[PDB]
Amino acid sequence: VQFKLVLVGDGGTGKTTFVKRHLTGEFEKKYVATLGVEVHPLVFHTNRGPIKFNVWDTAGQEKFGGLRDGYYIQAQCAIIMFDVTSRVTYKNVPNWHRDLVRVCENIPIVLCGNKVDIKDRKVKAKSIVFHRKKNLQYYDISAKSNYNFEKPFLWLARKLIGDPNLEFVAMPALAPPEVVMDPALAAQYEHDLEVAQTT
Ligand SMILES: Nc1nc2c(ncn2[C@@H]2O[C@H](COP(=O)(O)OP(=O)(O)O)[C@@H](O)[C@H]2O)c(=O)[nH]1
Numbered sequence: 001v002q003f004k005l006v007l008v009g010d011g012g013t014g015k016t017t018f019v020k021r022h023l024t025g026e027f028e029k030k031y032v033a034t035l036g037v038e039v040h041p042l043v044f045h046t047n048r049g050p051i052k053f054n055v056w057d058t059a060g061q062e063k064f065g066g067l068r069d070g071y072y073i074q075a076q077c078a079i080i081m082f083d084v085t086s087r088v089t090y091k092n093v094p095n096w097h098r099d100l101v102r103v104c105e106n107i108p109i110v111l112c113g114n115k116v117d118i119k120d121r122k123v124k125a126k127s128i129v130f131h132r133k134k135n136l137q138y139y140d141i142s143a144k145s146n147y148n149f150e151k152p153f154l155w156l157a158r159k160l161i162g163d164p165n166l167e168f169v170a171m172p173a174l175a176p177p178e179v180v181m182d183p184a185l186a187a188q189y190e191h192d193l194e195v196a197q198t199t
C-alpha cells in the first residue's frame with residue numbers, strides 16, 4: 001500500500017511530461033475535479049516488493065500563483081522540478097520548497113533539473129546548490145528521453161521503506177524516448193555533479 005507524492009515546480013518545467021512517462025500510471029490516472037489534480041498511480045517493483053506512488057500532477061494552476069493547501073496536504077514525499085534551460089525556474093525552487101514544508105514539515109524530497117537533453121544548458125552542476133543545506137537529493141533528468149527517470153523514485157522508496165539498499169527488480173513500461181539523451185553529455189553531467197559535490 002501507497003504514498004502520496006506531490007510534483008511541484010514552475011509552469012513549463014516538464015512536470016506533466018515527466019509523470020506521463022509511466023504508461024500505466026497515465027492509463028489509470030484519476031482526475032479530481034475538486035482539487036485541480038490528476039492523480040497518477042506509479043507502481044514500481046523493488047527487490048522487497050511493490051511500492052505505489054500516487055503522483056499528484058497539477059492541472060496547470062501553478063502558472064497563476066501558489067498551489068492550495070489541499071494539493072500538498074498529507075503528501076508523504078515530493079519531487080521539486082526546475083528546467084535546466086531557465087535560471088528563473090531554479091531561482092524559484094526555494095519558494096516551492098518553502099510552501100511544501102509549510103504544509104508537510106518533515107518529508108523526503110528530491111530536487112530534479114529537467115530537460116538536460118537540451119544542448120544549450122543554462123543551470124549547470126556548479127550552480128545547483130539549494131539541495132545541500134536542505135538535505136535533499138538532487139538528479140538531472142530528461143523526461144522526454146526517460147533519462148534518470150527511476151532515480152528520484154528509487155531514492156524516495158529507500159527513504160520511505162527505510163531500506164538503503166533497495167533496488168528496482170524490473171522497470172515499469174515507459175513511453176519510448178521522444179528525444180535522444182546524448183550518452184556523452186549524460187556521462188559528463190553525472191561526473192560534473194560528483195565534482196561540484198566535492199568542491
Ligand atoms: N527538450 C525537452 N523538452 C521537455 C522536457 N520535458 C517537457 N518538455 C517540454 O516542456 C514544455 C512544458 O512541459 P510540461 O510537461 O507541460 O510542463 P509543466 O507545465 O511543468 O507540467 C512542453 O513543451 C514539453 O514538451 C524534456 O525533458 N526535454
Ligand SMILES: [Mg+2]
Pocket residue numbers: 015016017058059060
Ligand atoms: Mg503540467
